[PDB]
RNA sequence: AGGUACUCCGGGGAUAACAGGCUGAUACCGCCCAAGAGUUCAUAUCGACGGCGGUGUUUGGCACCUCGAUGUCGGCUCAUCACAUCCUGGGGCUGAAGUAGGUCCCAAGGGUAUGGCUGUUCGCCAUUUAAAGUGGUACGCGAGCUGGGUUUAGAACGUCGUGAGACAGUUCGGUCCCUAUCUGCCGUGGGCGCUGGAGAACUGAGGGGGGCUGCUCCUAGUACGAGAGGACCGGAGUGGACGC
RNA sequence: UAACGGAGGAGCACGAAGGUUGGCUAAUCCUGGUCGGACAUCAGGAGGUUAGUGCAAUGGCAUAAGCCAGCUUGACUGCGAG
RNA sequence: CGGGUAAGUUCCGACCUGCACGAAUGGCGUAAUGAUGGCCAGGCUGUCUCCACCCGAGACUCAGUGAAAUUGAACUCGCUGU
RNA sequence: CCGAACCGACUAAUGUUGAAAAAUUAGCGGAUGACUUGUGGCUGGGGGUGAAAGGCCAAUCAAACCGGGAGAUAGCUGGUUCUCCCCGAAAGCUAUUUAGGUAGCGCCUCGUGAAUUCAUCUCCGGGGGUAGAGCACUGUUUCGGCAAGGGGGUCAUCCCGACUUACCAACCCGAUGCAAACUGCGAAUACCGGAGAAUGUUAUCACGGGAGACACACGGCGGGUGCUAACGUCCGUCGUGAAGAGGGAAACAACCCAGACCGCCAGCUAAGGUCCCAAAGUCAUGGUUAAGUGGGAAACGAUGUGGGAAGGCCCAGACAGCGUCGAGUCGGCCUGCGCGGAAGAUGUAACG
C-alpha cells in the first residue's frame, strides 16, 4: 500500500473508490497500485 | 562590519512661499529655487541664487507664457 | 539562471506588490501560462519550470518568457545582529501580479502545450492558468 | 596614557552572560511535481531541478520577566510525559522462493548493556543483548548527594606587552549553609457525620498494582529450494531481568 | 522628518575663470582630401545639445548661465523698505 | 609509530611537521630527598556488584526548662488556558 | 635516622542558628635545629616588619584604629504625613565629555491685553510630481526584422581577394515588460491664500508669574530595516493606553462600544447577544452543510454534495454490460458548502 497526499489513477485499471472518509485507490493488475489518502 | 555610507546635508527649505493670489509687500521672497524652475514676470526680480522677490506690492500670478511654455510668476498691483 | 548584466545600483528597497498586471494578452506565441496568483518568482524557479517546460515538447516549437528577474534581494548572514548596514545581495526576483503571462509557446499541437505547462507549473510557488491567444 | 583575577561604592533587569518568552531565517521531520537511476520499467528501492507545510530539538534574531541574586557543565539518586517506535505485537507492497531483508501503515502495554580512555555530555574502542529508541520536563532533579570541568585570591610555561598585567591557551593547588510554616507527596491517628444505640459480616461506585523476553526440543530436515540452506501455524521444556 | 538605511562629494580654485559691450553656438556620425592611421588639421552633409558648465549631485541655462574678443576693477564705501 | 590493556583522549619510549624550546628572567642531565604532579602492579578490602545484621549516640513518647531565621494580609487544591 | 613531650597543619568525616567567629575525631610532618619557649625591650601608618603570600601590624589591611575638617560630595536609589473644588501635560525638536543629566523651544497652568482672531463647511485663487500610468530620456529586458562590422571556415595567397557561415551581431525598425536614487503624463488628499453663512463659554495671537517633560507602548494607514520574522527596530500620520472607570472580546493597559459630579429596587439604546450555566427568539420565511465542518493551517489530491451557462453523442438505438439491449449518456468550464493533506510532550485541553 502507498500512503500519499496525491493519490491517482496509474493505470487503465486503476479505480478510485472513497471507503469511510478515505480516497484509495484499487488495482485489479497491479498490486503496486494499491494506494490510500493520508 | 560596518558602512560607507551615512551622509546627507541639510534640508534648504526651498519652494513655494507666496502662493496664487496672496497678498505681498515689496521685497518679499515669492520662491526659494535652485535654478530658474520659475521665472521673473512683472514687477518680480531674481537674485542671485534664483530667489524670485517682490518688487512691488501686490497679489502674486502664476502664468504659463512664450514659445517654450514657461511658467512666470508676477505682481498684480493692488 | 537570468540576471541584469549590470544595474545602476546594487541594492533596491524592499517595496510592496499591489495592483493587477501589465502584458496580460499572448502576444508572440499560441499559448500561454498565466498567473493567477500574486508572488515574487525567483530566477532558480523561471529556470526549473524552463527546463521542465522544454524537455516536455521535446524541444520543438519555440518558448518565450515573458517575466525577467531584475529585482535583487538581499540577506543577513547567519548569526549576525540586526544594524551594520543592508545585507548582501543574494538572489534576484521578478514581481508577479495577477493577470501575468509568463510563458509562451508556439508550434506545437494544443494538448502537448497544456502538458508541458503543467509540468512547468509544479515548479512554481503561484497559481497558474492555461491561456491561448484571442483575436482582439 | 594604561592595569586591576587584590579590588571598592552608588545604581540598572533602562543593558549582556543562564533559564523562560516572542520569532522560526537556520535545524529537524512530512509532503507536491517527476528528470532520471533501477537490463526493460519514474513511483520495489532511490529521487535531480524546483514547489508547499509541520514541529519548537539545533544554530541564531529580539531584549519582554528576573541584576534590594531565578546557583553552572558532567556524574549520582529518583523520575514523569510525548511518539516522529529501538525490541516485542498486528499489517500492505517488494526487484518477497525459503531463511533473512527493504519500505510504508497501525501500535506507547511492558522492556530497552557492562566496561577501557577522557571532567566530560558526546565519541571511539572491547564484550554483551530481543533491543541497547528519539525527544519534552528551568538543556527534569545541588533547601536530595557530588564538585572532576567552567569561573576569585597562590604559582609556572608558551605567547602578547616597555610595564602593571593579559590569553573560550596550557599547567599544579584551591570552604557547596538552611531544625519545613504553606502547597504537594508517603504513611498514621483524632473529630464529627451517615437520624435510637450497639457488635459483626458484606456489596463495590471508584482507585491503584501487574502486563518484558531468550534459548532448546517436537512439529520437521517437513513446506520452499538446482543446491546451499531452511520455515509459517501449533505444542512442550528450561532460563535472563523484574516483582511479591 | 529617523536608523551602524541606499549612493556620492567638500576642508578649494580664479585679477580673470570677476564687471561690461559687441559677437558666436554643441556632441556624434557620413563623404571627399598630402604625409595622416579608429581618432589631428580642411571641405560639405546629416544631427539638433545626445555637448558644454574650474571640481560631486540635483535644479537650471539659447535672451544662453556655454564659446570668443575689446575696454576695465562694482571682488566699490556708507546704508537699507521688506 | 611502538609498549602496556579484552578495550588506554591519561602513562612510558620514539619520530620532528618546535602554531609558539633553547643556554645564569640559564640549557641538558642528575644519586639522594618530597604530607609534590601523572601512570602501572602485588597485597588488601562493603569503594563497588548489592546490600544484610548487630552495638552504641540522636531521631520517637513522658516530665522539667525553653530558642532561631522568617513574616503585607490569608478562608494558603489539581489541570488547561490567560 | 625511628619515635613521645613540644612545634606544626597534608587527608577525610563531623560540625556549619557549632561545644568552637577556624574546632573535634582518626590518620599526617618536624622533633640537636635556618629548633622551640618564658619574661622584658625596639620598629608606627605611604610608615613598620616580611625565607615575599600584598602576608602581618589587637577576631580590622592594595594603606590600622580613634577623634576632627564633617551635614565631604552623591546628575544615583529610597522616602516625603490633613481635606475639597477648577484646569491639565510630555515622553518631541535643537545643543551638550551629551545620551537614565541639563538648557532654549514645543506641549500644561494662572494673569493681563488686543483683532471676526481661530476652527468646521461651501465657493474662489494657487504651487505641486506622490498613488496610478508610461517607456521619448537615464538604465534594465525579451522576441522578430534589417544589417555596418566582427569572428569560424573553403580556396586563393606576393598583393589581392572569391565564397561561405555553428556564427556573433551593434545601429535602426516593429513588438513585450521592469525602476527608491527613470519622467514627453498625472490624481485623491494635504497645504497656502481670499470670500461667505451658521455654530463654538476666545476656541486665536502677544506679554508676564509657576511648572512638569525631553525612557514611551500598542493598534490602523504610508514606508526604511529585518525573513512583507518577532509582543523586533527606525520614521511619518491618526486613535487609544499612559493619565480613563463602565459594557463587549471566556480570562485579556494599548482592539470594539463608550468618556464615571452625587443619589434611585424607573425607562431607551451601543458594541455584543437571546437552548442551560447566564439577562433576552428552542422567533418567522427560503436555502446550504453531515464534516461536530462550525470550534487551527498550505501546495496538492478526490465519481462528497448544491447551483449556473454551454458542448459532444443519442429511438436512423446512444453509454455500460453481454450483433443484442431500449433512454438517456459523456467530460470540460464557472461557482456555494464540505473531505483528505493534519505528529508533542502534567490532564479532556484548538466552541469558556
Ligand atoms: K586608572
Ligand atoms: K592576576
Ligand atoms: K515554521
Ligand atoms: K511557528
Ligand atoms: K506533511
Ligand atoms: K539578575
Ligand atoms: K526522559
Ligand atoms: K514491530
Ligand atoms: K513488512
Ligand atoms: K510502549
Ligand atoms: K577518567
Ligand atoms: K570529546
Ligand atoms: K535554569
Ligand atoms: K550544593
Ligand atoms: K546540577
Ligand atoms: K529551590
Ligand atoms: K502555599
Ligand atoms: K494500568
Ligand atoms: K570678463
Ligand atoms: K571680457
Ligand atoms: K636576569
Ligand atoms: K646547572
Ligand atoms: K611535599
Ligand atoms: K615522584
Ligand atoms: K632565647
Ligand atoms: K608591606
Ligand atoms: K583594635
Ligand atoms: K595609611
Ligand atoms: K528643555
Ligand atoms: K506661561
Ligand atoms: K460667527
Ligand atoms: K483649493
Ligand atoms: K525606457
Ligand atoms: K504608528
Ligand atoms: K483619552
Ligand atoms: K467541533
Ligand atoms: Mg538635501
Ligand atoms: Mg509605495
Ligand atoms: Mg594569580
Ligand atoms: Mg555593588
Ligand atoms: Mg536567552
Ligand atoms: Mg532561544
Ligand atoms: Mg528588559
Ligand atoms: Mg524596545
Ligand atoms: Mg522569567
Ligand atoms: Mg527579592
Ligand atoms: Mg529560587
Ligand atoms: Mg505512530
Ligand atoms: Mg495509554
Ligand atoms: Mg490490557
Ligand atoms: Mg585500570
Ligand atoms: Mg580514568
Ligand atoms: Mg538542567
Ligand atoms: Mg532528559
Ligand atoms: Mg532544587
Ligand atoms: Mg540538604
Ligand atoms: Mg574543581
Ligand atoms: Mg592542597
Ligand atoms: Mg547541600
Ligand atoms: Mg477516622
Ligand atoms: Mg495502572
Ligand atoms: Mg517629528
Ligand atoms: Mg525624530
Ligand atoms: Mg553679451
Ligand atoms: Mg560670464
Ligand atoms: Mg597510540
Ligand atoms: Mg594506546
Ligand atoms: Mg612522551
Ligand atoms: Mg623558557
Ligand atoms: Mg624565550
Ligand atoms: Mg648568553
Ligand atoms: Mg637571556
Ligand atoms: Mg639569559
Ligand atoms: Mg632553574
Ligand atoms: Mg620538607
Ligand atoms: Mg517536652
Ligand atoms: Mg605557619
Ligand atoms: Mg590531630
Ligand atoms: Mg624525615
Ligand atoms: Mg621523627
Ligand atoms: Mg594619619
Ligand atoms: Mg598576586
Ligand atoms: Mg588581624
Ligand atoms: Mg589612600
Ligand atoms: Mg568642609
Ligand atoms: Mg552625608
Ligand atoms: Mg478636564
Ligand atoms: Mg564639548
Ligand atoms: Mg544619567
Ligand atoms: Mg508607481
Ligand atoms: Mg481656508
Ligand atoms: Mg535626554
Ligand atoms: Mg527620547
Ligand atoms: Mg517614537
Ligand atoms: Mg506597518
Ligand atoms: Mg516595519
Ligand atoms: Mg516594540
Ligand atoms: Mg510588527
Ligand atoms: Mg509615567
Ligand atoms: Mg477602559
Ligand atoms: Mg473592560
Ligand atoms: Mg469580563
Ligand atoms: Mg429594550
Ligand atoms: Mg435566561
Ligand atoms: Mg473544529
Ligand atoms: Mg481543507
Ligand atoms: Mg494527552
Ligand atoms: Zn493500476
Known sequence: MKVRASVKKLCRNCKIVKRDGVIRVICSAEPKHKQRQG | ?78 | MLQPKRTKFRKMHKGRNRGLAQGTDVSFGSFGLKAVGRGRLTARQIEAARRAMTRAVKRQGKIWIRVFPDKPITEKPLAVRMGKGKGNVEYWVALIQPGKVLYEMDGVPEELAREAFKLAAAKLPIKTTFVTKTVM
Open chain 2, 1 to 78: 562590519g560596518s558602512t560607507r555610507n551615512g551622509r546627507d546635508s541639510e534640508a534648504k527649505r526651498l519652494g513655494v512661499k507666496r502662493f496664487g493670489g496672496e497678498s505681498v509687500l515689496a521685497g518679499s521672497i515669492i520662491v526659494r529655487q535652485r535654478g530658474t524652475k520659475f521665472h521673473a514676470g512683472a514687477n518680480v526680480g531674481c537674485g542671485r541664487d534664483h530667489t524670485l522677490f517682490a518688487k512691488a506690492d501686490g497679489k502674486v500670478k502664476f502664468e504659463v507664457k512664450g514659445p517654450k511654455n514657461r511658467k512666470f510668476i508676477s505682481i498684480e498691483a493692488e
